[PDB]
Symmetry: C3
Subunit: 308 residues, 3 copies
């Protein structure tokens, strides 16, 4: 069993996203920039390591890669590989814009090709099942598009950013209804319950991407997106004891992405002087939660129960 | 069986909402203000009575309250208790702003807490069933958020109003697909058919809330919301003979809310000189329908077919 | 069995829509106007012929008309009759505005009445089944509303156009979730697979209607709509070998509508200097695909495989 679960790519993801959030506090709080760099740096480091390990998985464990790619539920986790890359590229845009652009384009093309080749195959049916409607399905169809849009906007391709952001947003709106209906009816097996954190991502990631493409302007759409994001955040906070029914696990990093985005957009909402108190609370809460996740990850690594 | 069905809270609700609509005609038609007050007054009175009776239900019929709260379908009707309260507070804002603000905040906190504790609990699964997808589910997740947004906007907290309005709008867009699919597939049981009126509420209530948050400015979003609201209104008018297949009943008050909002937004569309003829038609039709509902309720009360 | 399958109305539709697209290149490429006229003319002619045939079907094959109207899946194809009419009227607006207005109003009233009488009937349940969720359901509830909105905007009733466009857009985003879930779960029978082309229509048609109601202004909404439309175009391009698994057929004209709109909106995006390269690519691709469809139709007609 390849010691590298694909979902672990959420570790370099949530950190990387969080780094970007701190990057938006460069002017207001100088130390923030330093902090961001640290996150960025470590995130990049971790990402690179995972990529290497994943490369190994492809060379000597290709049967597992094929099995997960053809699976109707696990394939979505592969979408973490391009997403993180884009985010990592975004980080590297602060030092080497050329390498950042190359990574962003590679990740965008990769995620678009993956979604076209796999998310579109599900329409053929016969492999996807009503029990395969999971939050992780957001990653290829929703999260990847938002990440591509934000990364392209950071490069300056604002129109292409609008295109990718709209694709991701409408895909989110089109998938979430059936996902929530499935959760209400059948809910989710305990071992996938951690992935419920992904349900938090679309509402916030979206606005973050939006706030990255429209030059950080706070308008009605961003406020609406925060409305729904906070609704989902309260819903998941209520369910958190149920999510960890069998105890804490690395899968909780599924939350981090959304939480990270909740920080990112918060910075914008602080810059635009729109709900400054709520923005401060969201930023502090996201940082605290991601710090607790990092501490839990360090404890798991120390105890030796991090790799499967 | 406590003589007080929770759905009866739609009576003080539909009137109260309608009152607010008339309050928007104070400048254009002085007598309108007087009419609004009457509605407001009576609505408030009715609400208070029901609250008292509901308190009785809590003190001496707590088993029924627990049963309805734990039910996957009836719990939604409890959301009428905060909603109505908020609306009543809105009315009181024309006389005592402080009491109105206190009531609005109490109702907003109550509905948010109820949605967090219960609507998010359905994601645990095992109690919600495919046959429990009813229009009444709009009340906790959709109607409550729109009412809170409108009330907060009336108080002046416009940004928090956008947050709540967006939460409600996205929740509506996310729940309506599965609800309409269930209605198409499985025929709603006759005794629940009256609740089909709630399907009319989100399309109009939404825009009303929007028109209360953006200072009554008529833009593309409001026109789109009326587009879908009129589509649903025609759809339900076609189905009305089927909705009352087994005869008229107090449950038809489920329509009133939406109809009331149909009047409210209409006033704004009349002020903005956008579709003045359609605005007049919508206002007159909603007022006539609510008047017929009031006459039917009076007839039921006189005939002793109002209370269980 | 009547010789003109209702779905064949997509032939005069797809051409007609395409004609409108070319009509937007009158100022930039004079020959374009001529080309548009040609298409318009032929489209109109074809439409008229089909109308006559359908009249015949009503006079001497009313049993088949009743069967298709009462069917939960085939009824949607009847919605092509008003839609096409409206489009034909649009074409005639370049020569005789009065006849164009009469046709547009007749088509709008007809499609609205049809959707009210039938699409709202499905809510009763017992006739619509989970296996009856097909892309063709877009035609009465979504495509008709967008076509009516665009036609009314062309006449100058921009507010009524906004109403119809919003109705269509909200119906689209409320139906597509369950449709895509059904496609993922239960697939689609091969003889209906061609109708999956309709899945391409709403993302593009929508924006086209929008770009026809807002005077061709390119804003965030249109770019988002293209984002989703291009996502769907890629998804369907990937599936095209599977869509024609049993071979090419006239049903592929289901694509043309969407493709036609993809050209139409493209012209607007070219005028607004927004993604000019992508606009040119989309226009050329739509024209090439519709030309291939026309060639295939001519080949089928010559070989005698066109009429059933």
């Amino acid at each position: 069993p390849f010691p590298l679960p694909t979902g672990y790519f959420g570790i370099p993801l949530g950190l990387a996203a969080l780094s970007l959030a701190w990057f938006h506090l460069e002017n207001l709080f100088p130390a923030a920039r330093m902090v961001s760099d640290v996150l960025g740096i470590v995130a990049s480091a971790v990402w690179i390591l995972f990529i290497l390990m994943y490369a190994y998985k492809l060379r000597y464990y290709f049967e597992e890669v094929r099995a997960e790619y053809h699976s109707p539920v696990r394939f979505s986790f592969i979408a973490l590989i391009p997403i993180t890359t884009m985010l990592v590229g975004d980080i590297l845009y602060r030092w080497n814009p050329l390498i950042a652009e190359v990574l962003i384009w590679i990740g965008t093309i990769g995620q678009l090709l993956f979604s076209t080749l796999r998310v579109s195959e599900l329409w053929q049916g016969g492999v996807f099942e009503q029990k395969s409607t999971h939050p992780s399905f957001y990653l290829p169809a929703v999260a990847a598009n938002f990440t591509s849009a934000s990364s392209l906007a950071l490069l300056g391709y604002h129109d292409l950013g609008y295109l990718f952001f709209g694709a991701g947003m409408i895909a989110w709106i089109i998938f979430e209804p059936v996902l929530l209906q499935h959760l209400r009816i059948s809910s989710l097996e305990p071992q996938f319950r951690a992935t419920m954190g992904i349900v938090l991502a679309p509402a916030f990631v979206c606005v973050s991407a939006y706030l990255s493409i429209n030059h950080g302007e706070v308008d009605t759409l961003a406020k609406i997106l925060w409305g729904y994001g906070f609704l989902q955040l309260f819903f998941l906070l209520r369910l958190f004891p149920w999510i960890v029914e069998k105890g804490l696990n690395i899968g909780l990093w599924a939350f981090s992405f959304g939480l990270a985005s909740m920080a990112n957009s918060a910075t914008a909402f602080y810059h635009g002087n729109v709900l400054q108190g709520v923005s401060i609370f969201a930023f502090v809460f996201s940082n605290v939660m991601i710090g607790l996740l990092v501490l839990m990850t360090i404890y798991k690594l120390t105890k030796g129960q991090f790799f499967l």
